[PDB]
Amino acid sequence: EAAAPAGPKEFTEVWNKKAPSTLIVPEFPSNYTAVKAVGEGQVHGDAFPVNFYTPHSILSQAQKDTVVLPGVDGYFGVKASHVPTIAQLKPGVVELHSGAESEKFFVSGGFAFVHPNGVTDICVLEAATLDQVDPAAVKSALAAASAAQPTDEFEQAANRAAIELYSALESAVEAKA
Amino acid sequence: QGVLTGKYDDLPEMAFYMVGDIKEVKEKADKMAKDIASRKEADNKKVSEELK
Amino acid sequence: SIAELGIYPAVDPLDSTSRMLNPNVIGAEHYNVARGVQKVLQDYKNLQDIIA
Amino acid sequence: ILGMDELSEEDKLTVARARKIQRFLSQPFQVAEVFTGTPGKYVDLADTISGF
Amino acid sequence: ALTGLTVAEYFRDIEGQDVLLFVDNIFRFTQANSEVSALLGRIPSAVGYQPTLATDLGGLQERITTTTKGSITSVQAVYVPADDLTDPAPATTFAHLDATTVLSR
Amino acid sequence: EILVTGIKVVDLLAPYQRGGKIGLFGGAGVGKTVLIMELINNVAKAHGGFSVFAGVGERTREGNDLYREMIESGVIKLGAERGNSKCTLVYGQMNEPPGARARVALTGLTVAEYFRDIEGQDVLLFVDNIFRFTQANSEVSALLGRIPSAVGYQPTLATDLGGLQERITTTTKGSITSVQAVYVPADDLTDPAPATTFAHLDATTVLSRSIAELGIYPAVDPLDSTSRMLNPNVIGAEHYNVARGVQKVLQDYKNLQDIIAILGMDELSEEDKLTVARARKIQRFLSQPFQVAEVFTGTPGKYVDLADTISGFQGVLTGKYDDLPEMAFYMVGDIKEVKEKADKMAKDIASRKEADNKKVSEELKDIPSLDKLVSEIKEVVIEEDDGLEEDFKAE
Amino acid sequence: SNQAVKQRIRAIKNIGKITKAMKMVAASKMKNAQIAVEQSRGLVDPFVRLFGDFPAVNSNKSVVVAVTSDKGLCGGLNSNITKYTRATLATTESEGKDVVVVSIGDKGRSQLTRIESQRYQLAIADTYKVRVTFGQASLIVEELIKHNPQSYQILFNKFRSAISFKPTVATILSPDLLEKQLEDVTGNSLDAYDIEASHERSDVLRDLTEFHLGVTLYNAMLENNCSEHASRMSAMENSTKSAGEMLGKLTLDYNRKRQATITTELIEIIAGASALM
Amino acid sequence: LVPIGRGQRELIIGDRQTGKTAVAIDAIIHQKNCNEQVPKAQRVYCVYVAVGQKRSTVAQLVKLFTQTGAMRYTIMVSATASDAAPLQFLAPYSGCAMAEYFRDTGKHGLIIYDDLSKQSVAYRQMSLLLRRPPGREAFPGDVFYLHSRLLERAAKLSKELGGGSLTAFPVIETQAGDVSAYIATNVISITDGQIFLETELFYKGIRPALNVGLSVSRVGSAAQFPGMKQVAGTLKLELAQYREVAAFAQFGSDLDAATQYVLERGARLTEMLKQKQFAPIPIERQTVAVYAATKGFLDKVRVQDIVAAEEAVISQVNPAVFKILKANGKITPALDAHLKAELRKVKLPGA
Amino acid sequence: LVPIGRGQRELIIGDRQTGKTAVAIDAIIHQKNCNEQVPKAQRVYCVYVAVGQKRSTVAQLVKLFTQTGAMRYTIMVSATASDAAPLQFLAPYSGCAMAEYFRDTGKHGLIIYDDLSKQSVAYRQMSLLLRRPPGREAFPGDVFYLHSRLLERAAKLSKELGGGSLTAFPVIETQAGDVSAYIATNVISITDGQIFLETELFYKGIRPALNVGLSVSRVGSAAQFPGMKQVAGTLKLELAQYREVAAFAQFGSDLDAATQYVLERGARLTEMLKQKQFAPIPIERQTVAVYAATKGFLDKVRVQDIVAAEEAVISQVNPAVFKILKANGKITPALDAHLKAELRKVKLPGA
Amino acid sequence: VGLSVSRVGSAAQFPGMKQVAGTLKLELAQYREVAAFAQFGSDLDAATQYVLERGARLTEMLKQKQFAPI
Ligand SMILES: Nc1ncnc2c1ncn2[C@@H]1O[C@H](COP(=O)(O)OP(=O)(O)OP(=O)(O)O)[C@@H](O)[C@H]1O
Ligand SMILES: Nc1ncnc2c1ncn2[C@@H]1O[C@H](COP(=O)(O)OP(=O)(O)OP(=O)(O)O)[C@@H](O)[C@H]1O
Ligand SMILES: Nc1ncnc2c1ncn2[C@@H]1O[C@H](COP(=O)(O)OP(=O)(O)O)[C@@H](O)[C@H]1O
Ligand SMILES: [Mg+2]
Ligand SMILES: [Mg+2]
Ligand SMILES: [Mg+2]
């Protein structure tokens, strides 16, 4: 079970045994990352570290205390010193709290990991704020999506992914105050 | 004036080589748009044999 | 240079002049077509250094 | 090409030093005070060396 | 130019002062000597200057010195033909200059 | 018939005809006297016949150096055994007036023509700066009451040069092999005095200045030095084929020099950055350390056989030596020595020693005290203020 | 002859400003790519603190991507990582394994068939025509899902600064083929996390590895696009210097030829006039 | 590319050691080759005028014209370099007067004034020493008239004067490709065509080193061999396309397939026109071997062995086609489909 | 790098204000300093010919040669810019006669024809005013003979003729680094060596601005100091390597830590070869410093300290080293075992 | 505009033309040095696209027909 410990440090020696010596070792993206998982720390009490990223934009890096995540089984919560969760998210609303105020983005489906050092890392592709969603086209697409009953499993999987998104897009505009 | 304003911008650029006026460049572009398709089946097809 | 392109008659269109290229002797349609041709050719000679 | 925040801190210091060197090379001239109004100043050598 | 030199040489040699002789376009001195050398039928040298180019510039510029009585200090405006610093009139003129004050726009 | 000279670029790209005329062009310190001395050393000692050196308008130090070198080498014997000598020197050097330099090439030809016509044998006729004959006639002709020709020369330039040069031939009764260095003035091959001399020679060896500034010696321009022998019915087929292949690779490199100049080697294709590497390799392989240049370079001289240079350039044209570095080819004799220098230059990149094996402290009876060494210094005397007045007053 | 030098001077004089224009174009492109690369760097952090960095694995099939440029004016970018994907592909194959060569860019398919053609399978171009998005990066990730290796290799010039382009390797392990197999260290290092997904651990790992390869491929072709613009800015600064120094040589040669032309024509006039007088 | 009719004057202009004397010698040797297969009214008796060369060069050429057998048609007029400047001045008029005998008697001549520039140099010496006032490059005023009144004696006479002809081949040596020189511009403006040879194409392996873009012949296709004329205009056109697709071939990554076909076809055509010296090919084998490359029969063959592929094409087709293309004077339709197929059963050094 | 023997002709060719006169001045002043430490038989008497110069610069130079004490051995033959052109034409010959006095009677002479370019300008004036036909750059045809007649008189005479010598230093002013001008290439093909002083090394502080790759002296290596002959071999080798790596790695592209080693080694050798003006160095103090910079004792000294660290080496080494090296003339295998030891015990700055 | 000078034209003209002639001189001198750069108009900085539009606006303003002096 431990007969091949690969890694970034051990890559240099096996590289230098069969490379031209002029080139320095090819670098690694883990060398630019400051927070690990098995390293203890990055908790310090009530405010726990969140990382809410999209590809096209980074929207959060700072600390929160309670975050609610639209998972596949229900909008579960993560507090300060949490259970490690590989959590796949359904299309829904994320809720980030720092106190009495709340910043709420409608996310569109993407994992979020609690690690053994208390960090959470919400990685979603398209994250729309609730004040940037048009609340008018939420039904005009949904009616045609529920009406489109196709003959192929690929297109009906597309229709299912459409309607579960649109049904979460209904209540993302109604009960927010 | 036609090639200035863009009236004949859909013709090829080498239809204009060694032609008289704006009609003969159209006929040369049509001759080219014949003969680009002539080089598909022009070898054997009992068309270039030794007994014809 | 134009004869190196094979184009005949090898008249340079940005060096051949006349006193008959005034709009008062040939009209505005001929003068403006000739000046449009000279403009697009000088644009092309000023872009050949980039497209080479 | 990149910005005034791109260069170093000591290179920003030499930008400050040189941009006040370039002003201090200037001088009003006594032959210009008739038509500029500000008087001219004969700067001695030791004052120039001790100033720079 | 020799007339301006002579009025300056009176202040150097008799009054015993420090003179500022201004020769506006030493190049026109060079080309005027080239004209009066070609008008006497002398065969011109390289690019078209006179055969006696270095000696005409020397006979002008070698009187602008510091004697024991005074000094002539000359400020000669210099024109460079075709922006050629290897042209024989600036190449012969720069051999006498002690300083260049390049003014820029 | 070919003349194997033991120089790589000469025997490969412009081979000298045994009996033909040879011209060594190049201007003002590119190496057309070092090349002619190495030609003397290679061809002349293994010649069999006589030699005639006609120095026309060159340095008198060079003539004294050649005279003493031939005395020390047995080509010239003095006094009782002078009949065993095999070289006549004829000197009209650059301190002589222009009447003497304009007629000393004819004296060299007359001493050679007695051997060719009357004695009837092969001779070698080396001339140092046959340009000085033309230049001396240009100095004379300015005063003889003549209208001057193009760039300032005499009107009778081609006919004076043809009257001199047409006597330097092989006939049916004898043979003159003539090597002449030809100065080009202000590095101009279009000057009329070299451009007339070009048409009078079989093999031409144009030495360029830029190739000397690259350090490549002899600085032969390989695409400007031609020969009447580079013909497959004369030098064989594979020699001619590798000569044309070398010249094609060097020309293809020469056409790339402006885009390598502005855009660098990171713009060319794979087929072009292959020929850049191969042409830079065969540029260095044309260089060769001379036996007569070892006095100021240290590297001993290399006689390179014709088979050696044909095979060695066939290898680098095929691609058999693409993994050797460039400076392995620099100043080596044949294709074995570039491989030996490559193995030595990747030994010398790994030659590392720890604590550098001094044994320099406390040398038991090797070093004395310094005062014991200053005791060994004999003292010179200072002979009273140059004494110049009295030994002038001896007269 | 004298007309060749004066026209060649104008040729080098327009080249020296054409390349300076392309240099400032590359700088203005780098200035807006600099905010996109900093918006898109951060998503490689959670996966590498979740999946690690396992380059030297016992992969039986492998896929390498060299993220190169499209345009050809980079100056030591596409051929540097060509040597890095040569020397790195010397390193992974040590047990007779299959390695599939993929490259992104027109200058990559023309620089990777020289060394590995029978091992070449896929070439991608036209990627930076308008911009880069997660759509096209996810699509070419699916085209690497048309292969099924045990691990994936990424090579790209990471835009550290405007001068340093570190050729970074990113190794992406196939999930249930190799990733959980490399995590069985006294049990399994992945079992500390509690799966919230709808299905088992293998399937959330499959979706996770697909998303991880897609996001590291997006980050690779954004890092490499910005270092491409930086390298073209640097190489069209060195080229302006070369076309300024060649122009400085050619103006001096033109002035020598100009003076020699006037002296020659003058000497001809003097000799012709003195033949009569 | 540059076809030459009996009665025109074709300048051979280039730098030193580029192919000028080689092209002239190949012309004289091919006249010996053609003189045995034609009746006695078509024979061309060459005259070689060698002005200013060495006597060793003239001895090499007389040895070559004896070895080939071309001496029985050739006159060799040699005012060499040791000879006086009036002899090098009056040598081309001597050789032209000797060739005017064959022109004026209905036969055909081929006069080659080798190094007409050295005639101009000898005339410059002869006039400067006569105290005549010099001009540009110290040449006299009448040095245009010197060459014009010599070259205009090469005429194709009318049928009332026998119908004979005289073809002149003046050779001019330039300095570093400079055709803006004095004598070079004179004899360029005098003659009909020019065979402009370059030393940068001579060292690229392209030998005879004909710069195709500048080499013209102003008789055009009026005196081109038909059959050679049927492929030659397309040969001109394809080399014209290959020349304007060049200076972009440093970008080997630039995969276009719209320019690479003509960039490869021009390479095969450039490799086609290479030829050894001292071996002129007859015209029928030439037009067969250009009909071999203009149609794309050699498109499989690598560019490094088309010089062997052409010899294999010429030696592996029937020796019965050249006999009927020499007689029939054009590619007849009873020959273009015969030798479409005869170039299919030939095997090539290229795969 | 370019060592000079007695009886040589060494051209000091450079641009305008690159320090050619300073090299000649340091040569004359060093001959004063070395004349007091030698016997009477080997003493160099200098001549400075000042052709076409300003009278003020000659006046400052006479002030310098009297305030050094170098006028005790120097003759000054001044033909300034105001003097007529036959005087400037004749002053090199007057100076060379005055130094041929010392050459003929067994003594040794040094002569500096300062700006032979201005002597050729004076002779061009004389020739064109004599209505003589000019040539390249309107020079007469015998402007080569003008300089070769003068520079051939610098000789090393035989034992039958006294044994005296005359060493000539012609100065030639180029225009923009144009080393291929007419007079420059005339004097290059007369003199034995060449000391090319580049303007861009001069404007970067590297003074004397010796172009090491172009300046040669192939006649001196046989006639130099035997300590410097074995010390400066690795100096010219490492300077050649420094020049080639600072010819290829100029862009800051790749660093290798071996080419960077010869980079930071040549960057110290180049700083060592700097020299202040009017202060020549005795040759043993030169070769000890060059020994200390090529045997690695000035390694890890920063590149802005070697012009102070070399004074530290010279001041802190025992003077018996210089006395032994001067008297023996060679770094003996005992003396370097002294010398590296006494070089380790030197208080170098920075440490 | 670059090579045409008038060394009395420093203040020898219409004063109403002098209110705008310095701005026209600078706005073209800003344009002559950058027109050679960007013959392409694709990827231009905001500081260079304004000069490459204003220079073309002023150049076509400064032309006029023959025999019609204003
Ligand atoms: N087509 C060819 N193939 C092979 N070799 C050639 C060819 N043409 C010329 N050569 C060789 O190139 C050299 C060129 O000499 P050429 O006969 O061209 O002299 P030239 O240029 O006419 O006049 P000059 O003798 O003054 O150079 C000759 O050695 C010849 O053998
Ligand atoms: N070795 C040196 N170290 C420092 N400065 C130097 C050195 N050599 C010359 N200079 C400076 O260079 C300047 C010009 O020197 P020098 O008079 O020797 O030049 P030059 O070659 O005679 O020029 P020109 O011939 O035009 O007078 C002087 O001001 C001198 O101070
Ligand atoms: N084969 C060579 N090896 C090394 N140096 C050479 C060689 N040939 C010439 N040189 C250089 O050329 C100088 C001599 O040039 P020289 O042969 O006298 O040419 P020229 O006669 O044209 O002046 C020497 O100082 C030497 O530095
Ligand atoms: Mg010599
Ligand atoms: Mg010939
Ligand atoms: Mg000086």
Q: Give the domain ranges of chain F.
A: 1-229, 230-351
Residue F168 identity (one-letter amino acid): I
Token code pair at residue I219? 């006649």
CB distance H74 to H46 below 8 Å: yes
Q: How far does the centroid of ligand 2 lie from the alpha carbon of residue I21, in Å?
A: 7
Show the CA angle centred on residue J34, arms to residues J32 and J38, nearest 5°: 130
Show the CA angle centred on residue H292, arms to residues H290 and H298, nearest 5°: 120
Closest partner residue to G263 (CB to CB) among E46, E84, E86 is E46
Nearest-CA distance from C12 to chain H in Å?
A: 18
Rounded Cα gap, residues G80 and G76, in angstroms: 6
Q: How far does the centroid of ligand 3 lie from the alpha carbon of residue B47, in Å?
A: 72
H218 is catalytic: yes
Match 């397309």 to its residue by tokens.
Answer: H234
Residue A69, SS3 per DSSP: strand
Please check whether residues A71 and A95 belong to one and the same domain. Answer: yes
Q: Which residues have CB under 8 Å from F230's CB, separation 6+?
A: F13, F14, F15, F240, F243, F244
Helix spans in G41-169 (H): 45-48, 80-91, 106-109, 134-145
I195 forms beta bridges with I12
Residues of chain H with CATH 1.20.150.20: 225-351
Nearest-CA distance from G242 to chain I in Å?
A: 11
Print burial letters for F100-137: b (CB count within 10 Å at least 16), e (below 16): bbbbbbbbbbebbbebbeeeeebbbbbbbbbbbbbbbb
Closest partner residue to F223 (CB to CB) among H54, H122, H203 is H203
F18 is catalytic: no
Q: Distance from CA of residue A130 to its chain's centroid?
A: 17
Residue H70 identity (one-letter amino acid): A
Instruction: Give me the resolution in angstroms, 1 decimal.
Output: 3.5
CB-CB neighbors (< 8 A) of B49 in chain H = 337
Q: Which residues have CB under 8 Å from I351's CB, separation 6+?
A: none
Residue I268, SS3 per DSSP: helix
| Helices H116-128 and F157-165: angle between axes, nearest 10 degrees | 110
CB distance I94 to I111 below 8 Å: no
Specify the fold of I1-218.
Answer: Rossmann fold (3.40.50)
**C-alpha distance from residue H8 to each of A176, H148, H151, H158 (Å):** 98, 13, 9, 14
Contact: G79, F266; criterion CB under 8 Å: yes
Residue G216, SS3 per DSSP: helix
CB-CB neighbors (< 8 A) of G264 in chain E = none
G62 forms beta bridges with G99, G151
Give the distance between the most distant pair of CA atoms in chain J. Answer: 41
Rounded Cα gap, residues H101 and H93, in angstroms: 13
Match 């704006």 to its residue by tokens.
Answer: B22
Q: Which residues have CB under 8 Å from A100's CB, separation 6+?
A: none
Does residue H19 line the site of ligand 1, with CB under 6 A? yes
Residue of minimum CA distance from atom 11 in ligand 2: I19
DSSP codes, B5-50 = HTTT-SS-TTSSTT--SHHHHHHHHHHHHHHTTTTTS-S-TTSS-S
Contact: G275, H132; criterion CB under 8 Å: yes
Q: Which of H9, H136, H218, H344 is catalytic?
A: H218
Number of domains in chain A: 2
Does residue F33 line the site of ligand 3, with CB under 6 A? yes
Closest atom of ligand 2 to CA, residue I22? 18
Q: Distance from CA of residue F128 to its chain's centroid?
A: 11
CB distance I93 to I145 below 8 Å: no
Chain J contact present for C17, CB below 8 A: no
Residue F31 identity (one-letter amino acid): G
**C-alpha distance from residue G159 to each of G48, G164, G209 (Å):** 19, 7, 24
Closest partner residue to G76 (CB to CB) among F151, F262, F266 is F266
Please check whether residues A105 and A54 belong to one and the same domain. Answer: yes
Residue I120, SS3 per DSSP: helix
CB distance G75 to A62 below 8 Å: no
* Contacting subunits of G (3+ beta carbon pairs below 8 A): A, C, D, E, F, H, I, J
The superfamily CATH assigns to domain G1-24+236-277 is ATP synthase, gamma subunit, helix hairpin domain (1.10.287.80)
| Cβ count near G5 (within 10 Å) | 16
CB-CB neighbors (< 8 A) of H251 in chain F = 267, 269
Rounded Cα gap, residues I340 and B4, in angstroms: 85
Strands I74-80 and I44-53: parallel
The separation between the first and the last C-alpha atoms of chain J, rounded to the nearest angstrom, is: 19
Residue F127: left if φ>0, alpha if ψ -120 to 50, beta else—which one? beta
Cis before residue H208, ω within 30 degrees of 0?
yes
Chain I contact present for F94, CB below 8 A: yes
Q: Which domain holds residue A65?
A: 37-133
Rounded Cα gap, residues F287 and F304, in angstroms: 11
Residue A39, SS3 per DSSP: coil
Token code pair at residue I155? 């000789």
Question: Nearest-CA residue of chain B relative to C31?
Answer: B1
Q: How far does the centroid of ligand 5 lie from the alpha carbon of residue B44, in Å?
A: 51
Residue G228, SS3 per DSSP: helix
Contact: I175, E96; criterion CB under 8 Å: no
Cis before residue D28, ω within 30 degrees of 0?
no
Rounded Cα gap, residues F105 and F52, in angstroms: 11
* Contacting subunits of H (3+ beta carbon pairs below 8 A): B, C, F, G
Give the residue among F88, F29, F40 at the shortest CA–CA distance from F301.
Answer: F40
Specify the fold of F1-229.
Answer: Rossmann fold (3.40.50)
Residue F224 identity (one-letter amino acid): D
Provide the number of CB pairs (under 8 Å) joining chain E to chain I.
66
Token code pair at residue J64? 């006029």
Rounded Cα gap, residues A46 and F359, in angstroms: 70
CB distance H121 to H52 below 8 Å: yes
Residue G112, φ and ψ in degrees, nearest 5: -110, -10
Contact: H338, B50; criterion CB under 8 Å: yes
Residue H3 identity (one-letter amino acid): P
CB-CB neighbors (< 8 A) of J48 in chain G = 24
Q: Which residues have CB under 8 Å from G162's CB, separation 6+?
A: D2, G30, G230, G233, G234
CB-CB neighbors (< 8 A) of C51 in chain J = none
Residue D29 assigned ligand-binding role: no
Q: How far does the centroid of ligand 1 lie from the alpha carbon of residue H73, in Å?
A: 23
CB distance H95 to F120 below 8 Å: no
Residue F147, SS3 per DSSP: coil
Give the residue among A62, A59, A32 at the shortest CA–CA distance from A50.
Answer: A62
Token code pair at residue B21? 């006026």
Q: Which of F8, F21, F38, F58 is catalytic?
A: F58
F370-374, Cβ contacts within 8 angstroms, sequence gap of 24 or more? F370/I318, F370/I320, F370/I321, F370/I324, F370/I338, F371/I320, F373/I320, F373/I324, F373/I334, F373/I335, F373/I338, F374/I320, F374/I323, F374/I324
Q: How far does the centroid of ligand 3 lie from the alpha carbon of residue F30, in Å?
A: 6
Rounded Cα gap, residues A114 and G53, in angstroms: 19
- What does CATH list as the number for H225-351? 1.20.150.20
Does residue H211 line the site of ligand 1, with CB under 6 A? no
Residue of minimum CA distance from atom 18 in ligand 1: H19
F32 is catalytic: yes
Residue F210, φ and ψ in degrees, nearest 5: -65, -35
Entry field: residues in chain D: 52
Domain boundaries, chain G: 1-24+236-277, 25-235
The separation between the first and the last C-alpha atoms of chain E, rounded to the nearest angstrom, is: 28
Please check whether residues A164 and A147 belong to one and the same domain. Answer: yes
Rounded Cα gap, residues H287 and H229, in angstroms: 9
Q: Which residues have CB under 8 Å from F54's CB, separation 6+?
A: F90, F92, F104, F105, F107, F108, F109, F111, F112, F125, F126, F127, F128
CB distance F264 to G75 below 8 Å: yes
- State which CATH number among 1.10.1040.10, 1.20.150.20, 2.160.10.10, 1.25.40.10 fits the domain covering I219-351: 1.20.150.20
- What does CATH list as the number for H1-224? 3.40.50.300
Would you say residue A4 lies in a domain? no
Strands F21-26 and F175-183: parallel
* Contacting subunits of J (3+ beta carbon pairs below 8 A): C, G
Which top CATH class is F230-351?
mainly alpha
Would you say residue A26 lies in a domain? no
Contact: C22, J40; criterion CB under 8 Å: no
Four-point Cα dihedral I220, I225, I230, I235, nearest 10? -70
Question: Nearest-CA residue of chain C relative to G11?
Answer: C49
Residue I80 identity (one-letter amino acid): T
Rounded Cα gap, residues B14 and B16, in angstroms: 5
**C-alpha distance from residue A38 to each of A111, F255, G189 (Å):** 20, 61, 10
CB distance I269 to I301 below 8 Å: no
| Cβ count near H245 (within 10 Å) | 18
Nearest-CA distance from A112 to chain G in Å?
A: 9
Rounded Cα gap, residues J9 and G70, in angstroms: 52
**C-alpha distance from residue G53 to each of A25, G88, G178, I248 (Å):** 15, 15, 13, 38
A67 forms beta bridges with A78, A96
Cis before residue I280, ω within 30 degrees of 0?
no
Mutational test site, ligand 1, from H20, H117, H169, max ligand atoms within 8 Å of CB: H20
Rounded Cα gap, residues G33 and G27, in angstroms: 10
Q: Do domains F1-229 and F230-351 have the same CATH topology?
A: no
Residue H68 identity (one-letter amino acid): T
Ligand nearest to the CA of I275: 2
Residues of chain I with CATH 3.40.50.300: 1-218
**C-alpha distance from residue F128 to each of B2, F91, F125, F220, F324 (Å):** 72, 10, 10, 17, 39
Residue I299 assigned ligand-binding role: no
Residue H305 CB-density burial (10 A; 0-12 exposed, 13-18 middle, 19+ buried) = middle
DSSP category for residue G159: E
DSSP category for residue I17: T
Rounded Cα gap, residues F111 and I110, in angstroms: 39
Q: Which residues have CB under 8 Å from I338's CB, separation 6+?
A: F367, F370, F373, I321
Rounded Cα gap, residues H247 and H255, in angstroms: 15
Nearest-CA distance from I56 to chain F in Å?
A: 31
CB-CB neighbors (< 8 A) of B4 in chain C = 33, 36-37, 40
Closest atom of ligand 1 to CA, residue F229? 29
Q: Percent helix, strand and coil across chain E, each rounded to 5?
A: 45, 10, 45
